[PDB]
Design a protein around this ligand. Structure first.
Ligand SMILES: Cn1cnc2c(c(-c3ccc(O)c(C#N)c3)cn2CC(=O)Nc2ccncc2Cl)c1=O
Ligand SMILES: Cn1cnc2c(c(-c3ccc(O)c(C#N)c3)cn2CC(=O)Nc2ccncc2Cl)c1=O
Lengths: 122, 122
């Protein structure tokens, strides 16, 4: 019987993104080939099967640096990181294969399915 | 022109709450009279003018314990903490004055306004 605040979750996510943009309480750097992306591990865990499985393990929970597989496309990763923090996916013909492969690796099922739909609708 | 994922923010918030429930990557304990509540500072900052102002300051950013004002009602605080992590506000006649006073202190304007509406609709 709770009062539902329909914009609250999106307001929270927006504010988490503004914290990321100011590097406030970020606790990990994700290294992808020659690039580095700082983030909150809690957001990564909340959005990715791969990052959940990594940080839930007490062996790895306190890691401050994660190196992704050398084959991962940095643009694809950046698109997905932005998606995590915004709910918006920048999917185009020039990046769709890279985004889909990256989302498979990150274990983000809704985005992989959306990539399949994009391929089908094209 | 981004594809919008309408359930993503609520999915993220739900997963942040499950992390809280397992005490995974919580970095602060909020002490309210005789009670203690663990939380993520990033979520607190994202939801509260008071917590934003506290932790944005480098003087206080790394605090692991925050003691709230002794007058703050623990039930009211718990209701608002749950709201932060769920978008659901448990507002009733028996708790409305305590919730409204706590939301004023925490600087959560939408909840204070909702408390005003509850009082008016009653
Ligand atoms: C396949 N797969 C596996 N794991 C996933 C996801 C997503 C997800 C969330 C929103 C999305 O928009 C998309 C997309 N696209 C994907 C998140 N997680 C991690 C997870 O469940 N964490 C968790 C579990 C239990 N308690 C606490 C926590 Cl933090 C996923 O898709
Ligand atoms: C009055 N007031 C002041 N500050 C507030 C809020 C809310 C808020 C959010 C969702 C809600 O559902 C409710 C309610 N009810 C209240 C959050 N914040 C903190 C904030 O803006 N943080 C921030 C600012 C800039 N960059 C990064 C960050 Cl993290 C507020 O209401």
């Amino acid at each position: 019987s709770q009062i539902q605040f329909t914009r609250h979750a999106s307001d929270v996510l927006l504010n988490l993104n503004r914290l990321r943009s100011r590097d406030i309480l970020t606790d990990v750097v994700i290294v992808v080939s020659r690039e580095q992306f700082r983030a909150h591990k809690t957001v990564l865990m909340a959005c990715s099967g791969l990052f959940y499985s990594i940080f839930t393990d007490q062996l790895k929970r306190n890691l401050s640096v994660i190196n992704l597989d050398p084959e991962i496309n940095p643009e694809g990763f950046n698109i997905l990181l932005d998606f995590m923090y915004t709910s918006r996916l920048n999917l185009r013909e020039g990046n769709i294969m890279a985004v889909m492969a990256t989302a498979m690796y990150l274990q983000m099922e809704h985005v992989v399915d959306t990539c399949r739909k994009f391929i089908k609708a094209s």
